[model samples]
Target: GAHMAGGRSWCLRRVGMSAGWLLLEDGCEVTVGRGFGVTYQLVSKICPLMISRNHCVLKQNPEGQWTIMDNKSLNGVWLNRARLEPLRVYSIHQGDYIQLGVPLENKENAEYEYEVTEEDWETIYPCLSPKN
Candidate 1:
């Protein structure tokens, strides 16, 4: 990855089963992978843990070579209700809904708080540089 590409990490704001959206107000991060965020062009997903640990949540994986789990559920996440487990990978679009919380508005912005791939400090290191 290019220095700039891997330089600054993006924040993550995923929807949780709690039916609430996670906040990355600032200095927050999360990671994504298989059966995570959004669905890919190749594989599919079904989110169960809408919102997980570390204030982390699902946000429909990126559209890659895989497919599935990308499609928005007619009914998003549920708090006490049953939620699909081991999500295909993709969950739902930001501001889409999470059964209880506010649907993610900006996928890009949601990604700004939690990491869709890398760790928090790891990605923010580059941007931490003192501005000239």
Candidate 2:
């Protein structure tokens, strides 16, 4: 198999379950929520209570770091029950818990965990930089 470019590694896995894991790579952005035109994608679509169509987005930055941004959603995006700054970029950490939709607003719950792995930091090395 060919090695991936950028060399950053990360993936999302369900707690205690491996069937519906989401694998993410560079330039990958996942739109999560219950809205149309969105990825409407949810780990547990069965209980999409307070989720918005453009609830939140998970993006892999050009620097190989993961970020989550709220999309001015209805219930708002949350990390560990704390509201995220709307439309602001936030660095994601491994083992951090992200919840979509308001737990109290619609009286429903939605949450996921993010995981990251270390790899060669090619961006730190100038060997790949083009000469002026």
Candidate 3:
């Protein structure tokens, strides 16, 4: 495959989840919440009480910068251990840690780490190209 320039990509690594990271391409947005159907990114199953049905949203702006907004959750969302204001946008960067809901003893709430990767056609082509 020929190399070409591509937009930057970001991902959320669920702390303690062995599953692969959730990919976020340029201009992509995802909702982080609880419950079965409403949430685009489900956080936790056991501790639904702490997370709201529509907790927060993660979005990539047109300029390719990522941001997160807390959706007036009761327990609230934390960025790098600091609580975010409800309904306000906060810029996020690589290596940032996001915690959903307040931490509890013996049982941890849903948490994730932000990551960024520079993508090129050589890395993105296979995911777009037809399989042999």
Candidate 4:
């Protein structure tokens, strides 16, 4: 079945714009926001960048490392259940949990899988091109 918000709220890009819209420093539109407060611009950092607040945001860095911010009360965030030290990159993946002011649904894997090989779509035909 198709996941309703990936079976969680912040997964599909619903809820307030600040949930994980652009980074708090970059937000300008959610009615409510992370450590910074709200605006309407969708969080610039996909669904995984850190925007720590009473309701902190989560992020995945280009290095495949993750970020969980302490957006509220200067309290620390958590990744995979361990308290997250703010502003530093932590290794993460699909299924990893990030908790702060509130718990946003997360896919908890420390590593992500990528598709590199094409599937055999040519079983029934002679020439099926791979998307790659």
TM-score of each: 0.22, 0.62, 0.69, 0.33
RMSD values for the candidates in order, in angstroms, are 13.5, 9.6, 5.8, 14.6
Q: Which residue pairs does candidate 3 place in steric collision?
A: none
Better of 1 and 4 by lDDT: 4
**Distance from true location, Cα of 11 in model 2, Å:** 2.2
lDDT per prediction?
A: 0.29, 0.59, 0.63, 0.34
lDDT of 2 at 14: 42
Model 3, span 66-107: residue lDDT tens: 888998988888888889999989988878888778766775
Per-residue error at 65 for model 4, in Å?
5.6
TM-score leader: 3
Tens-digit lDDT string for candidate 4 (1-132): 764323321121222222222211212211223434433222324434433333443454565343444444343555556775645545544455444333335843322111111122222122211111
**Candidate 2: what lDDT?**
0.59
Predicted structure 1, TM vs. truth: 0.22
Clashes of each: 44, 1, 0, 30
Q: Residue 119 of model 2: what lDDT?
A: 36
Candidate 1 vs candidate 3: the lDDT winner is 3
Question: For residue 33, what is the lDDT in candidate 1?
Answer: 27
Tens-digit lDDT track of model 2 for 32-63: 66555654355345555566666777787778
